[PDB]
Enzyme design. Structure first.
Site, PDB file in Angstrom:
ATOM      1  N   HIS A  40     -64.439 -36.772  18.443  1.00 23.34           N
ATOM      2  CA  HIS A  40     -64.763 -35.060  17.983  1.00 23.34           C
ATOM      3  C   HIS A  40     -64.683 -34.396  17.024  1.00 23.34           C
ATOM      4  O   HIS A  40     -64.844 -33.322  16.777  1.00 23.34           O
ATOM      5  CB  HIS A  40     -65.235 -34.385  19.409  1.00 23.34           C
ATOM      6  CG  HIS A  40     -64.586 -33.100  19.538  1.00 23.34           C
ATOM      7  ND1 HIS A  40     -63.234 -33.566  20.797  1.00 23.34           N
ATOM      8  CD2 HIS A  40     -63.916 -32.003  19.798  1.00 23.34           C
ATOM      9  CE1 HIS A  40     -62.901 -32.911  21.128  1.00 23.34           C
ATOM     10  NE2 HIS A  40     -62.574 -31.814  20.271  1.00 23.34           N
ATOM     11  N   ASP A  42     -64.540 -40.359  24.290  1.00 23.38           N
ATOM     12  CA  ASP A  42     -64.853 -39.279  23.296  1.00 23.38           C
ATOM     13  C   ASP A  42     -63.200 -39.813  22.520  1.00 23.38           C
ATOM     14  O   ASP A  42     -62.010 -38.931  21.966  1.00 23.38           O
ATOM     15  CB  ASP A  42     -63.995 -37.631  23.782  1.00 23.38           C
ATOM     16  CG  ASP A  42     -63.875 -36.421  22.270  1.00 23.38           C
ATOM     17  OD1 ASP A  42     -64.384 -36.648  21.541  1.00 23.38           O
ATOM     18  OD2 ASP A  42     -63.521 -35.308  22.518  1.00 23.38           O
ATOM     19  N   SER A  92     -56.826 -29.801  20.193  1.00 19.36           N
ATOM     20  CA  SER A  92     -57.513 -31.381  20.456  1.00 19.36           C
ATOM     21  C   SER A  92     -56.722 -32.306  20.342  1.00 19.36           C
ATOM     22  O   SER A  92     -56.268 -31.866  19.208  1.00 19.36           O
ATOM     23  CB  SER A  92     -59.019 -30.738  20.563  1.00 19.36           C
ATOM     24  OG  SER A  92     -59.909 -32.557  20.573  1.00 19.36           O
TER      25      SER A  92
END
Ligand SMILES: CCCCCCCCO[C@@H]1O[C@H](CO)[C@@H](O)[C@H](O)[C@H]1O
Ligand SMILES: CCCCCCCCO[C@@H]1O[C@H](CO)[C@@H](O)[C@H](O)[C@H]1O
Lengths: 151, 151
Positions: free
Chosen positions: B29, B51, B103
């Site tokens: 993402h 992901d 992230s």
């Protein structure tokens, strides 16, 4: 009370004693008596050099002792009040996580291995550098950051 | 720098990619391109289930990959912004230690083995529980707290 025991002085808990390897350990400056009679009656020796009081763990309690290790890689560790950073050769914690009374609590790794015993701490603002007894190159050593108070 | 690499999109760092085992791993993402020419030209495979975007680490770089483990005894682990707690099968952080842009950052044990990759977090008050990718020996798993938001 399995490996960690309250030290009490005139009714008040002043600190803690810990069973580590084959020793019963307590910070020497912590006043009072270990609130376990099997422990309280042992032969204890004081060392000012390490701020330690030690006795041989009794036979019926040897297997209750905490495992330990000399090996402390830089990173984070555990104690009763949360995370403890080891880096630069210093243990540190969020200021206020620790207070007078916590002296004697062990610092341990993720496998429950004791790496140090807390003696007190020095407020450096956001963080507090701990005064500790530990092993350096497998040799017992007291490390005290500048401006540390006994806990 | 060595095992961790910025992903940038239209100038801004959006997240990170890491070398782990024999794979270049990056949160799927996270927008943009890995800011490393040797890595950006690899064949990437995208898994919406995890992901994750993955590619084989180039030969001349396989020894730059950090090791990883499934071993996650409860306690504290390390990431760039400080201590990460693992307990109850969940990774948590002091709220405000992490934010969008984090992230892709890996979580390491004291041996420097990766035990998780950060995907995002769920603000739960004093603490924030992390959405992560994590291991069970030879299998990978997406662990996501409810109401977690991607970072
Ligand atoms: C965790 C259970 O175990 C014991 O709990 C006792 C009760 O507080 C503590 O005093 C001891 O440190 C701990 O070993
Ligand atoms: C985020 C921490 O980054 C570190 O940087 C180090 C030196 O560049 C290397 O060990 C690795 O790149 C990484 O672990």
């Amino acid at each position: 009370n399995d490996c960690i025991f309250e030290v009490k002085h005139e009714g008040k808990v002043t600190g803690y004693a810990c069973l580590v390897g084959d020793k019963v350990m307590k910070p020497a400056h912590v006043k009072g008596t270990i609130d376990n009679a099997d422990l309280a009656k042992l032969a204890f020796k004081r060392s000012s050099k390490y701020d330690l009081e030690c006795a041989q763990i009794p036979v019926h309690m040897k297997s209750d002792a905490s495992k330990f290790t000399h090996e402390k890689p830089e990173g984070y560790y555990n104690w009763h009040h949360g995370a403890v950073q080891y880096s630069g050769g210093r243990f540190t914690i969020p200021t206020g996580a620790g207070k007078p009374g916590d002296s004697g609590r062990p610092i341990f790794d993720n496998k429950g291995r004791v790496v140090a015993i807390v003696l007190g701490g020095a407020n450096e603002g956001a963080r507090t550098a701990l005064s500790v007894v530990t092993w350096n190159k497998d040799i017992v050593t007291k490390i005290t950051p500048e401006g540390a108070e006994e806990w």
